[PDB]
Design an enzyme around this catalytic site. Structure first.
Site, PDB file in Angstrom:
ATOM      1  N   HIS A 163       0.895  -0.787  -0.127  1.00  0.00           N
ATOM      2  CA  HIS A 163       0.176   0.048  -0.640  1.00  0.00           C
ATOM      3  C   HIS A 163       1.336   0.789  -0.330  1.00  0.00           C
TER       4      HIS A 163
ATOM      5  N   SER B 218       1.371  -0.941  -6.315  1.00  0.00           N
ATOM      6  CA  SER B 218       1.043  -1.888  -7.446  1.00  0.00           C
ATOM      7  C   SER B 218       1.944  -1.820  -8.923  1.00  0.00           C
TER       8      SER B 218
ATOM      9  N   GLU C  20       5.644 -34.944  -1.001  1.00  0.00           N
ATOM     10  CA  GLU C  20       4.436 -34.533  -2.824  1.00  0.00           C
ATOM     11  C   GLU C  20       4.813 -33.814  -3.645  1.00  0.00           C
TER      12      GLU C  20
ATOM     13  N   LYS D  15     -13.807  -7.494 -11.806  1.00  0.00           N
ATOM     14  CA  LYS D  15     -13.096  -8.682 -12.443  1.00  0.00           C
ATOM     15  C   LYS D  15     -12.134 -10.223 -11.760  1.00  0.00           C
ATOM     16  N   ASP D  16     -12.510  -9.577 -11.219  1.00  0.00           N
ATOM     17  CA  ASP D  16     -11.806 -10.839  -9.704  1.00  0.00           C
ATOM     18  C   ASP D  16     -12.934 -12.270  -9.464  1.00  0.00           C
TER      19      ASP D  16
HETATM   20  C1  HEM Z   1      -0.868 -16.624   0.875  1.00  0.00           C
HETATM   21  C2  HEM Z   1       0.548 -15.777  -0.335  1.00  0.00           C
HETATM   22  C3  HEM Z   1       0.073 -14.826  -0.518  1.00  0.00           C
HETATM   23  C4  HEM Z   1      -0.672 -14.131  -0.567  1.00  0.00           C
HETATM   24  C5  HEM Z   1      -2.274 -13.758   0.444  1.00  0.00           C
HETATM   25  C6  HEM Z   1      -0.160 -12.603  -1.171  1.00  0.00           C
HETATM   26  C7  HEM Z   1      -1.351 -11.734  -1.900  1.00  0.00           C
HETATM   27  C8  HEM Z   1      -0.992 -10.363  -2.838  1.00  0.00           C
HETATM   28  C9  HEM Z   1      -1.716  -9.448  -2.821  1.00  0.00           C
HETATM   29  C10 HEM Z   1      -3.568  -9.448  -2.995  1.00  0.00           C
HETATM   30  C11 HEM Z   1      -0.812  -8.997  -3.748  1.00  0.00           C
HETATM   31  C12 HEM Z   1      -1.716  -7.872  -4.981  1.00  0.00           C
HETATM   32  C13 HEM Z   1      -2.029  -8.124  -6.168  1.00  0.00           C
HETATM   33  C14 HEM Z   1      -1.927  -8.905  -6.926  1.00  0.00           C
HETATM   34  O1  HEM Z   1      -0.490  -8.684  -7.542  1.00  0.00           O
HETATM   35  O2  HEM Z   1      -1.751 -10.017  -7.117  1.00  0.00           O
HETATM   36  C15 HEM Z   1       0.390  -9.553  -4.080  1.00  0.00           C
HETATM   37  C16 HEM Z   1       1.338  -8.659  -4.658  1.00  0.00           C
HETATM   38  C17 HEM Z   1       2.078  -9.255  -4.290  1.00  0.00           C
HETATM   39  N1  HEM Z   1       2.980  -9.796  -4.135  1.00  0.00           N
HETATM   40 FE1  HEM Z   1       2.113 -11.780  -2.547  1.00  0.00          FE
HETATM   41  N2  HEM Z   1       0.603 -13.147  -2.182  1.00  0.00           N
HETATM   42  C18 HEM Z   1       1.195 -14.399  -1.045  1.00  0.00           C
HETATM   43  C19 HEM Z   1       2.832 -14.515  -1.314  1.00  0.00           C
HETATM   44  C20 HEM Z   1       3.592 -14.024  -1.982  1.00  0.00           C
HETATM   45  C21 HEM Z   1       5.133 -14.310  -2.317  1.00  0.00           C
HETATM   46  C22 HEM Z   1       5.003 -16.104  -2.437  1.00  0.00           C
HETATM   47  C23 HEM Z   1       5.576 -13.532  -3.338  1.00  0.00           C
HETATM   48  C24 HEM Z   1       7.250 -13.380  -3.456  1.00  0.00           C
HETATM   49  C25 HEM Z   1       7.963 -14.678  -3.294  1.00  0.00           C
HETATM   50  C26 HEM Z   1       5.235 -12.866  -3.161  1.00  0.00           C
HETATM   51  C27 HEM Z   1       5.335 -11.466  -3.881  1.00  0.00           C
HETATM   52  C28 HEM Z   1       4.338  -9.902  -4.100  1.00  0.00           C
HETATM   53  C29 HEM Z   1       4.338  -9.352  -5.648  1.00  0.00           C
HETATM   54  C30 HEM Z   1       5.934  -8.689  -5.649  1.00  0.00           C
HETATM   55  C31 HEM Z   1       3.636  -8.654  -5.216  1.00  0.00           C
HETATM   56  C32 HEM Z   1       3.573  -7.150  -5.635  1.00  0.00           C
HETATM   57  C33 HEM Z   1       3.477  -7.185  -7.478  1.00  0.00           C
HETATM   58  C34 HEM Z   1       2.736  -5.938  -8.030  1.00  0.00           C
HETATM   59  O3  HEM Z   1       2.066  -5.803  -7.812  1.00  0.00           O
HETATM   60  O4  HEM Z   1       3.509  -5.572  -9.547  1.00  0.00           O
HETATM   61  N3  HEM Z   1       3.245 -12.413  -2.431  1.00  0.00           N
HETATM   62  N4  HEM Z   1      -0.152 -10.319  -3.106  1.00  0.00           N
HETATM   63  C1  HEM Z   2      -2.466 -23.075   5.093  1.00  0.00           C
HETATM   64  C2  HEM Z   2      -3.188 -23.469   5.689  1.00  0.00           C
HETATM   65  C3  HEM Z   2      -2.789 -25.628   5.818  1.00  0.00           C
HETATM   66  C4  HEM Z   2      -2.092 -26.154   4.565  1.00  0.00           C
HETATM   67  C5  HEM Z   2      -1.834 -26.070   3.204  1.00  0.00           C
HETATM   68  C6  HEM Z   2      -2.120 -28.050   4.642  1.00  0.00           C
HETATM   69  C7  HEM Z   2      -2.365 -28.479   4.363  1.00  0.00           C
HETATM   70  C8  HEM Z   2      -2.464 -29.659   4.687  1.00  0.00           C
HETATM   71  C9  HEM Z   2      -2.010 -31.665   4.016  1.00  0.00           C
HETATM   72  C10 HEM Z   2      -1.320 -31.380   2.411  1.00  0.00           C
HETATM   73  C11 HEM Z   2      -2.424 -32.133   4.852  1.00  0.00           C
HETATM   74  C12 HEM Z   2      -2.871 -33.487   4.079  1.00  0.00           C
HETATM   75  C13 HEM Z   2      -3.819 -34.204   3.391  1.00  0.00           C
HETATM   76  C14 HEM Z   2      -3.593 -35.807   2.896  1.00  0.00           C
HETATM   77  O1  HEM Z   2      -2.576 -35.525   1.587  1.00  0.00           O
HETATM   78  O2  HEM Z   2      -4.546 -36.114   2.716  1.00  0.00           O
HETATM   79  C15 HEM Z   2      -3.202 -31.764   5.805  1.00  0.00           C
HETATM   80  C16 HEM Z   2      -4.057 -32.300   6.828  1.00  0.00           C
HETATM   81  C17 HEM Z   2      -4.928 -32.332   7.388  1.00  0.00           C
HETATM   82  N1  HEM Z   2      -5.452 -30.537   7.789  1.00  0.00           N
HETATM   83 FE1  HEM Z   2      -4.025 -29.224   6.983  1.00  0.00          FE
HETATM   84  N2  HEM Z   2      -3.489 -27.332   6.223  1.00  0.00           N
HETATM   85  C18 HEM Z   2      -4.017 -25.358   6.231  1.00  0.00           C
HETATM   86  C19 HEM Z   2      -4.465 -26.151   7.105  1.00  0.00           C
HETATM   87  C20 HEM Z   2      -5.610 -26.002   8.403  1.00  0.00           C
HETATM   88  C21 HEM Z   2      -5.749 -26.540   8.518  1.00  0.00           C
HETATM   89  C22 HEM Z   2      -5.785 -24.601  10.527  1.00  0.00           C
HETATM   90  C23 HEM Z   2      -5.964 -27.166   9.932  1.00  0.00           C
HETATM   91  C24 HEM Z   2      -7.078 -26.951  11.319  1.00  0.00           C
HETATM   92  C25 HEM Z   2      -7.121 -26.105  12.020  1.00  0.00           C
HETATM   93  C26 HEM Z   2      -5.562 -27.957   9.412  1.00  0.00           C
HETATM   94  C27 HEM Z   2      -6.057 -29.544   9.820  1.00  0.00           C
HETATM   95  C28 HEM Z   2      -5.821 -30.870   9.487  1.00  0.00           C
HETATM   96  C29 HEM Z   2      -6.094 -31.879   9.661  1.00  0.00           C
HETATM   97  C30 HEM Z   2      -7.070 -32.409  10.734  1.00  0.00           C
HETATM   98  C31 HEM Z   2      -5.498 -32.901   8.492  1.00  0.00           C
HETATM   99  C32 HEM Z   2      -6.022 -33.853   8.898  1.00  0.00           C
HETATM  100  C33 HEM Z   2      -5.317 -34.867   7.297  1.00  0.00           C
HETATM  101  C34 HEM Z   2      -6.764 -34.705   6.480  1.00  0.00           C
HETATM  102  O3  HEM Z   2      -7.427 -34.227   6.899  1.00  0.00           O
HETATM  103  O4  HEM Z   2      -6.369 -35.147   5.585  1.00  0.00           O
HETATM  104  N3  HEM Z   2      -5.330 -27.803   8.340  1.00  0.00           N
HETATM  105  N4  HEM Z   2      -3.654 -30.378   5.704  1.00  0.00           N
HETATM  106  C1  UQ6 Z   3      -7.518  -6.112  -1.524  1.00  0.00           C
HETATM  107  O1  UQ6 Z   3      -7.057  -6.823  -2.457  1.00  0.00           O
HETATM  108  C2  UQ6 Z   3      -7.325  -7.856  -1.563  1.00  0.00           C
HETATM  109  C3  UQ6 Z   3      -6.389  -8.853  -1.272  1.00  0.00           C
HETATM  110  O2  UQ6 Z   3      -5.397  -7.916  -0.243  1.00  0.00           O
HETATM  111  C4  UQ6 Z   3      -6.741 -10.061  -0.884  1.00  0.00           C
HETATM  112  C5  UQ6 Z   3      -5.484 -10.879   0.077  1.00  0.00           C
HETATM  113  C6  UQ6 Z   3      -7.667 -10.909  -0.908  1.00  0.00           C
HETATM  114  C7  UQ6 Z   3      -7.816 -12.448  -0.856  1.00  0.00           C
HETATM  115  C8  UQ6 Z   3      -8.294 -12.569   0.717  1.00  0.00           C
HETATM  116  C9  UQ6 Z   3      -8.618 -11.406   1.606  1.00  0.00           C
HETATM  117  C10 UQ6 Z   3      -9.085 -10.138   2.161  1.00  0.00           C
HETATM  118  C11 UQ6 Z   3      -8.862 -12.032   3.268  1.00  0.00           C
HETATM  119  C12 UQ6 Z   3      -7.530 -12.639   3.896  1.00  0.00           C
HETATM  120  C13 UQ6 Z   3      -7.464 -13.966   4.630  1.00  0.00           C
HETATM  121  C14 UQ6 Z   3      -6.878 -14.384   5.941  1.00  0.00           C
HETATM  122  C15 UQ6 Z   3      -6.332 -12.415   6.783  1.00  0.00           C
HETATM  123  C16 UQ6 Z   3      -7.509 -15.667   6.675  1.00  0.00           C
HETATM  124  C17 UQ6 Z   3      -8.111 -14.874   8.257  1.00  0.00           C
HETATM  125  C18 UQ6 Z   3      -8.941 -16.466   7.957  1.00  0.00           C
HETATM  126  C19 UQ6 Z   3     -10.113 -16.319   8.275  1.00  0.00           C
HETATM  127  C20 UQ6 Z   3     -11.259 -15.625   7.230  1.00  0.00           C
HETATM  128  C21 UQ6 Z   3     -10.567 -17.369   8.235  1.00  0.00           C
HETATM  129  C22 UQ6 Z   3     -11.483 -17.264   9.966  1.00  0.00           C
HETATM  130  C23 UQ6 Z   3     -12.405 -18.204  10.144  1.00  0.00           C
HETATM  131  C24 UQ6 Z   3     -12.735 -18.919  11.250  1.00  0.00           C
HETATM  132  C25 UQ6 Z   3     -12.474 -18.177  12.671  1.00  0.00           C
HETATM  133  C26 UQ6 Z   3     -14.541 -19.670  11.152  1.00  0.00           C
HETATM  134  C27 UQ6 Z   3     -14.370 -21.497  11.231  1.00  0.00           C
HETATM  135  C28 UQ6 Z   3     -15.488 -21.863  11.768  1.00  0.00           C
HETATM  136  C29 UQ6 Z   3     -16.387 -21.310  12.746  1.00  0.00           C
HETATM  137  C30 UQ6 Z   3     -15.989 -20.796  14.244  1.00  0.00           C
HETATM  138  C31 UQ6 Z   3     -17.712 -22.569  13.346  1.00  0.00           C
HETATM  139  C32 UQ6 Z   3     -18.300 -23.421  13.841  1.00  0.00           C
HETATM  140  C33 UQ6 Z   3     -18.578 -22.882  14.625  1.00  0.00           C
HETATM  141  C34 UQ6 Z   3     -19.823 -23.219  16.065  1.00  0.00           C
HETATM  142  C35 UQ6 Z   3     -20.649 -22.911  16.690  1.00  0.00           C
HETATM  143  C36 UQ6 Z   3     -19.288 -24.582  16.192  1.00  0.00           C
HETATM  144  C37 UQ6 Z   3      -8.674 -10.466  -1.838  1.00  0.00           C
HETATM  145  O3  UQ6 Z   3      -9.651 -10.724  -2.101  1.00  0.00           O
HETATM  146  C38 UQ6 Z   3      -8.528  -9.010  -2.169  1.00  0.00           C
HETATM  147  O4  UQ6 Z   3      -9.187  -8.282  -3.463  1.00  0.00           O
HETATM  148  C39 UQ6 Z   3     -10.716  -7.955  -2.367  1.00  0.00           C
END
Ligand code: HEM
Ligand code: HEM
Ligand code: UQ6
Ligand code: CDL
Ligand code: PCF
Ligand code: PCF
Ligand code: PEF
Ligand code: PEF
Ligand code: PEF
Ligand code: HEM
Ligand code: HEM
Ligand code: UQ6
Lengths: 126, 57, 93, 62, 385, 49, 126, 385
Positions: free
Chosen positions: E202, E206, E272, E228-229
């Site tokens: 910000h 971008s 994987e 567009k998204d």
């Molecule tokens: C969960 C992981 C990530 C999220 C949610 C995320 C999110 C975002 C968002 C919303 C933007 C602005 C919109 C866009 O350019 O698409 C952005 C821009 C950018 N991100 Fe990420 N990002 C992630 C991981 C990464 C990683 C792994 C890298 C590099 C290793 C990275 C580098 C950048 C850069 C350089 C920009 C600016 C690009 C430009 O505007 O020209 N981000 N990211």
């Molecule tokens: C960035 C977020 C996450 C990633 C990338 C991720 C990734 C993974 C992966 C690769 C597996 C293996 C599943 C398979 O090979 O069958 C797995 C299993 C699992 N994950 Fe996650 N995870 C994420 C978040 C979470 C969170 C927040 C929870 C719980 C609060 C969760 C709960 C579990 C559980 C219970 C399993 C049990 C194995 C299964 O159900 O397949 N994960 N996760």
């Molecule tokens: C501004 O430009 C952007 C942008 O920058 C980004 C990142 C995104 C994409 C993503 C987001 C804005 C969200 C970013 C994500 C996070 C910060 C992750 C945070 C995690 C959550 C929001 C999930 C949390 C959920 C829970 C706690 C629910 C769990 C379930 C419950 C409690 C049910 C159980 C209930 C009972 C009663 C037992 C855009 O779409 C976007 O364009 C608008």
């Protein structure tokens, strides 16, 4: 949140009834003495909350010399409270000095605001 | 008329949103039966109900 | 809050670009336009223009690495068959 | 070229610009979006909530 | 003032989503950031609802996943969404990082934003690895004893680290129970670094595919890039649904349907598919200590990019030598991944050692030399003398 | 795979609904971008100050 | 982040050499045509990244008529790219129009900044 | 400018804990907010390290806590820190909320800040309840039975909500694994709502004991209130260490060392001590539906305060009657807890019904009537009419 117009309306009725002015005022003087703000160098008008639009215009229209004095009394009380002490007995605010200096500027600002509201809800007798 | 169609469905958002919901209730019910009926006829002669009939007659 | 450092983007009204003079822009409301206009023409002629100018930067690297992979895969099949068991001895040990 | 001379927009404009007809067309395409999205949101919240109900093995011991 | 700008909480929403000034020429590669935020929400919500039926004991972990598939209502949907969702997470992230490399989004005014992204990439690899061990299949068990055993190569107190990480003498019940506790925690750390990611974006905004300033023509984010998204959100959701209901096990390994056995070893041990390229880098070095350093360096060489680029133009759009070598690096990455799934045989050993060299030579040799060459060609091509 | 029969039926409703939403989204995006897409700029160099 | 002083020093040596000029300049002309920035109505000097103090100084000292023209070429390129098209062939920038208009301002600003760094690290003999 | 003001991340630190302008008159009661921040960190860190050795199956939940005390190294320190730390969490929070009630911190400019605090109070009550159930003793099983059975009084849908919450027909294995997963998540929601708590405080700043403006005399936060907060931080850990090493079971119930048994009622069933005042309000209404509604009203009436205070002065420092009736409410709260730990006997039933009336009459009757009377006394005591 209770307006000073309403406060004065109840107060002025009490102060003009011979019976009511005889028992309420003596207990009001003791209430003020026990409140203890005069022992920090403050008047009552310095304790009014000022974060409303009505009290912001009253403080704007206050004469300049009275505004400088109020700033000193407020800063003095913060420093005294910071030390957990009281002011020396000769520096306490006396009864004849605890006057409502800001009251006329509040009642006039409040009257203007009340008239505005009555004029946005006007209904011509057509 | 296109003018009376706009004044009835698209002028007020309380009617536009309410119509969308009422159309979502109907679509939900009908879409389920149509998909199940087609799916169960593409797989005739293989379901349990068909097999249950061949061991009873 | 205190102000922060100097950046390279502003906001609406002070975005921070050069001063503009002599540029006029025109636009028409979308409610009076035709969306999807020209999609069929663009789907064939514009796509051929874009494909022709970039396909050499992508395909030549792709074809180089694919020939390397197939050649190295075919050699492995030769060493682990009866025909190439003699070579497997020298190359390995 | 004078700034009072607007450019040519002829090949993107509708040849019959009716307010009522052209608005009902656009709102019918966003209503279709909102009808299907509202239907897909119901199937999402039902899927997650129903997973919290009694499992198959628990129901067998009723 | 409008309420959306005077309110304390709505101002943050307005400044990031509604009124954010965007360049008018950003193409569909700029839609991957919003997709990555949908992937994170999908993983967290499905994981929490599955965690209400999971047991982390080493004698109950494998059977609890079957209890989810068989007995839990809609349990197989949750598991297939979570398992395939993690595979789609790395697809989008890989091409999100490739957009920044092609268009030069790592350059001077946005160096800090690039570095925070590298941190997010490291944390995501660890999170996926920890969850894969929570199934405790044959690939889950045996993949953990070749990764945790890597730290035994540290000269001093290397063996004491693995004992503290194992909680015992090998991969056992203490290890599996603590890996589930960490797999719950790291996703919430990732959500905190995304906010820091958006805060650094910000500042200057971008970039654009032209590589020049975008301060002369801007449009608000709302009603132009919100809609567009939505186009890519519905397209992303359709392809994932094809992999969940029609081919839910194509991206998996069939050996992970066998319960983990410390006494029988599988024929081939691989992670994987999205960790295969780094696995092939580790096996290339014929030494344990240098192999783990080289594998970790492969993530840290991304940080030298802002300093090895010597071009006065940001991006690859108008460069022919940089465009050609960008796709050499991309298709080198695929070859590295395929070697990581192969056996240690005669031709594949030498191929991995060459593709590993090309990986590091790109950041340290090819980019600096090519950038200098194109600087000169742009000059003598128009300055008559 | 005891859920095989019910999984394939549910995948038929998902794909049909999601394919029609994706197509309806392309039209809505093009309707909102029509003003920007068809936009014209002219330049008359200003006289020296 | 190579300085334009370094680029000019290397480039001039090629142009003053009769042997090198006949083998390198033909390659550079084909390199520029394949780059294709002229098909968007841009000169090369419009592509230089400007988010540094050196280029912010040079853009400040550019005359108004040049500055107004540059702002039009940049806006036109953003809208042309938005539509995934090119400009009509008669609107393309010609080779004789692709001149380094901003280069003298960049070199002058670069020479001043280098002399400031050599005087801050000065050491007085005797 | 300084690097602490120009950096994107440091500027948020500088603006909140370094250069923040604070009034010079705030006493030690303004130190409870920083203590609540340390309590939340303590609970999260001890919970995570304990979760590496815990099993949520209903047949292993009780034995896993006994495993932590006996087999895990320093495991009894973690458990007694987590159990007693939660008791100290509610001690500070009760005093934190009474400070703002005494000094009128809920009034006009800071209504949004007060409302966010009420949400944090609701979430913290739920988090403590869910973690108590995870031990699965005799008081946690039977406490969960009574609490979750009160939702069945909701018309039409009441019975279905209980089955969905239980996961079955009673408090069983699906319930216990449900509650551990939620106990891990809700503390992270609290941490995110604490940041919104600080954002709403930064718009107008803190208040002062005098109740007047503090814009005339300010001192920076760093080196003046950093070291004043360090005084109560050291005192906080001294009293906590006394209860952890010399009396770890004084604040608990001995019946929670008997493993949960659904077939034997544990005589009197009571919750932890900090939920006892709200337990007595529920039992005072001879009706399930009405009695349940009144229990959440006792937390929702706190939102009516900014509108039933008819005083033109903020705080009770200079108010005689308001000071007296403030401590009547405080000790009325203490008596309510005593009734909640008592049996249903002849005197105690009426004692809790009258004390319930005083709790609600304070906000809706006592404060409006008293505040109008004092306004007149201030007026007629100095005006010469
Ligand atoms: C969960 C992981 C990530 C999220 C949610 C995320 C999110 C975002 C968002 C919303 C933007 C602005 C919109 C866009 O350019 O698409 C952005 C821009 C950018 N991100 Fe990420 N990002 C992630 C991981 C990464 C990683 C792994 C890298 C590099 C290793 C990275 C580098 C950048 C850069 C350089 C920009 C600016 C690009 C430009 O505007 O020209 N981000 N990211
Ligand atoms: C960035 C977020 C996450 C990633 C990338 C991720 C990734 C993974 C992966 C690769 C597996 C293996 C599943 C398979 O090979 O069958 C797995 C299993 C699992 N994950 Fe996650 N995870 C994420 C978040 C979470 C969170 C927040 C929870 C719980 C609060 C969760 C709960 C579990 C559980 C219970 C399993 C049990 C194995 C299964 O159900 O397949 N994960 N996760
Ligand atoms: C501004 O430009 C952007 C942008 O920058 C980004 C990142 C995104 C994409 C993503 C987001 C804005 C969200 C970013 C994500 C996070 C910060 C992750 C945070 C995690 C959550 C929001 C999930 C949390 C959920 C829970 C706690 C629910 C769990 C379930 C419950 C409690 C049910 C159980 C209930 C009972 C009663 C037992 C855009 O779409 C976007 O364009 C608008
Ligand atoms: C999320 C925040 C939404 C937002 O920006 O609202 C501010 C916005 C005010 O807009 P603004 O121009 O920024 O403010 C100008 C002034 O505040 C002046 O604003 P105003 O005079 O227009 O405000 C009037 C508003 C007063 O606003 C409120 O009290 C908000 C309601 C919160 C409860 O009261 C109403 O008219 C609301 C009732 C009608 C809406 C019926 C919708 C029902 C369901 C759909 O108020 C509304 O959008 C009103 C609708 C309320 C909620 C609809 C649901
Ligand atoms: C291969 C896909 C079809 C290609 C057909 C084609 O390219 O023919 C050209 C026309 C262009 O038609 P257009 O792209 O919609 O533009 C219309 C604007 N006009 C020209 C009226 C001013 O295309 C057409 O109008 C005919 C398309 C009808 C076929 C559609 C299904 C196939
Ligand atoms: C979760 C999925 C829920 C889908 C709900 C879709 C929906 O109901 O959209 C209806 C409205 C239409 O939005 P609109 O485009 O502004 O309508 C124009 C207003 N007229 C002129 C008609 C009065 O849209 C809205 O009112 C805003 C809905 C935002 C969600
Ligand atoms: C917050 C987390 C959201 C996660 C979304 C992930 C989306 C990825 C795409 C995978 C397909 C959907 C996942 C399974 C959900 C499902 O139930 O799909 C099954 C449904 C139909 O099934 P049914 O009703 O007949 O049976 C249910 C069992 N009684 O198909 C659809 O309606 C597809 C519509 C998707 C549109 C959703 C729009 C977003 C809503 C957000 C709220
Ligand atoms: C959408 C497209 C997604 C592209 C990647 C999909 C991975 C292929 C299937 C994986 C699962 C599997 O099938 O197993 C693993 C497969 C099978 O390899 P094998 O024949 O040696 O198995 C032996 C059978 N006995 O190996 C691979 O993955 C090849 C490695 C891929 C290279 C890494 C790609 C990194 C860049 C990604 C760019 C795209 C984003
Ligand atoms: C900060 C303090 C905030 C006010 C606390 C609310 C009232 C406490 C409940 C009292 C109660 O319910 O009882 C008292 C309880 C248990 O004693 P008892 O119930 O077994 O016997 C009751 C015999 N009359 O003492 C505690 O737990 C100590 C709590 C620490 C408070 C300091
Ligand atoms: C984890 C829970 C909480 C944390 C971490 C927290 C934190 C803080 C902090 C650091 C301050 C400023 C310092 C101070 O005034 O002591 C503060 C002020 C305040 N808090 Fe909280 N708080 C919490 C819960 C609550 C609750 C439950 C309420 C009310 C129901 C509340 C209401 C207030 C108010 C009104 C103020 C401003 C008072 C004043 O400055 O005069 N907070 N909070
Ligand atoms: C504000 C934060 C928290 C509060 C107020 C809280 C409260 C409690 C309480 C009151 C108990 C009952 C302990 C007893 O009576 O002996 C408990 C138990 C427990 N909690 Fe927490 N908790 C919090 C955070 C966490 C977190 C974040 C985790 C895990 C990541 C966790 C894990 C556990 C575990 C495993 C138990 C098992 C019983 C025990 O060890 O005593 N807690 N919690
Ligand atoms: C005096 O000034 C202050 C002030 O300084 C602070 C901090 C606060 C408090 C303010 C806050 C917003 C609270 C901050 C805290 C949170 C929001 C939550 C804290 C979060 C955590 C503690 C999570 C961290 C958890 C971990 C690191 C997990 C530990 C586990 C590990 C390391 C596993 C071991 C690793 C391996 C590989 C085996 C104040 O209110 C305040 O007064 C104004």
């Amino acid at each position: 949140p209770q307006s000073f117009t309403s406060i004065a309306r109840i107060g002025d009725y009490i102060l003009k009834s011979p019976v009511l002015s005889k028992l309420c005022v003596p207990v009001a003087n003791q209430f003020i003495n026990l409140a203890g703000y005069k022992k920090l160098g403050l008047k009552f008008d310095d304790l009014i909350a000022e974060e409303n639009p009505i009290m912001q215009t009253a403080l704007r229209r206050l004469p300049e010399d009275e505004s400088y004095a109020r700033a000193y009394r407020i800063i003095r009380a913060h420093q005294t409270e910071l030390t957990h002490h009281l002011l020396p007995r000769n520096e306490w605010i006396k009864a004849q000095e605890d006057v409502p200096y800001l009251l006329p500027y509040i009642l006039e600002a409040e009257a203007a605001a009340k008239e505005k509201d009555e004029l946005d809800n006007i209904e011509v007798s057509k | 008329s296109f003018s009376s169609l706009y004044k009835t469905f698209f002028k007020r958002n309380a009617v536009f949103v309410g119509t969308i919901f009422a159309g979502a209730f109907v679509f939900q019910t009908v879409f389920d039966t149509a998909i199940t009926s087609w799916y169960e006829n593409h797989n005739k002669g293989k379901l349990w109900k068909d097999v249950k009939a061949r061991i009873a007659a | 809050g205190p102000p922060s450092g100097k950046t390279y983007m502003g906001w609406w009204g002070h975005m921070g670009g050069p001063k503009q003079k002599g540029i006029t822009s025109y636009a028409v409301s979308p409610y009076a336009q035709k969306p999807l206009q020209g999609i069929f023409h663009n789907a064939v002629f514009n796509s051929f223009r874009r494909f022709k100018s970039q396909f050499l930067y992508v395909l030549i690297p792709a074809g180089i690495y694919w020939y390397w992979w197939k050649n190295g895969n075919e050699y492995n099949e030769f060493l682990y068959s009866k025909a190439g068991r003699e070579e497997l001895e020298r190359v390995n040990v | 070229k004078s700034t009072y001379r607007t450019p040519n927009f002829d090949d993107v404009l509708k040849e019959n610009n009716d307010a009522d007809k052209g608005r009902s067309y656009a709102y019918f395409m966003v209503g279709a979006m909102g009808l299907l999205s509202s239907a897909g949101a119901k199937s999402t919240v039902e899927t997650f909530i129903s997973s919290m109900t009694a499992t198959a093995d628990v129901l067998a011991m009723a | 003032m409008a309420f959306r700008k005077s309110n304390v909480y709505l101002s943050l929403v307005n400044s990031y989503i509604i009124d954010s000034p965007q360049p008018s020429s950003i193409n569909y590669w700029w839609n991957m950031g919003s997709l990555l935020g949908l992937c994170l929400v999908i993983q967290i919500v499905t994981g929490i609802f599955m965690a209400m039926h999971y047991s982390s004991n080493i004698e109950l972990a494998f059977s609890s996943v079957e209890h989810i598939m068989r007995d839990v209502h809609n349990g197989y949907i949750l598991r297939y969404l979570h398992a395939n969702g993690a595979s789609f997470f790395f697809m989008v992230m890989f091409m999100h990082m490739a957009k920044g490399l092609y268009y030069g989004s790592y350059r001077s005014p946005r160096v800090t934003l690039w570095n925070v992204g590298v941190i997010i990439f490291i944390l995501t690899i660890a999170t996926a690895f920890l969850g894969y061990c929570c199934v405790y299949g044959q690939m889950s068990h045996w993949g953990a004893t070749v990764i945790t055993n890597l730290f035994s190569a540290i000269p001093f107190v290397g063996n004491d680290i693995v004992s503290w990480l194992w909680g015992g003498f090998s991969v056992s019940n203490p290890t599996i129970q603590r890996f589930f506790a960490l797999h719950y925690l790291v996703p919430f750390i990732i959500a905190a670094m995304v906010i820091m990611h958006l805060m650094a974006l910000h500042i200057h905004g971008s970039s654009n595919p032209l590589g020049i300033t975008g301060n002369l023509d801007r449009i608000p984010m709302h009603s132009y890039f919100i809609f567009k998204d939505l186009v890519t959100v519905f397209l992303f959701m359709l392809i994932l649904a094809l992999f969940v209901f029609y081919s839910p096990n194509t991206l998996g390994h069939p050996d992970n349907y066998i319960p983990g056995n410390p006494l029988v070893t599988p024929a081939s041990i691989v992670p994987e598919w999205y960790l295969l390229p780094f696995y092939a880098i580790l096996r290339s070095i014929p030494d344990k200590l240098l192999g783990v350093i080289t594998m970790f360096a492969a993530i840290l060489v991304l940080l030298v990019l802002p300093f090895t680029d010597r071009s006065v133009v940001r991006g690859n759009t108008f460069k022919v030598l940089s465009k050609f070598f960008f796709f050499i690096f991309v298709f080198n990455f695929v070859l590295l991944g395929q070697i990581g799934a192969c056996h240690v045989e005669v031709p594949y050993v030498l191929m991995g050692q060459i593709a590993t060299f090309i990986y590091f030579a790109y950041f340290l040799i090819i980019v600096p030399v090519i950038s200098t060459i194109e600087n000169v060609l742009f000059y003598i091509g128009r300055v008559n003398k | 795979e005891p859920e095989h029969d019910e999984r394939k039926r549910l995948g038929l409703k998902t794909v049909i609904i999601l394919s029609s939403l994706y197509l309806l989204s392309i039209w809505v995006k093009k309707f909102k971008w029509a003003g920007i897409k068809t936009r014209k700029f002219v330049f008359n160099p200003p006289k020296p100050r």
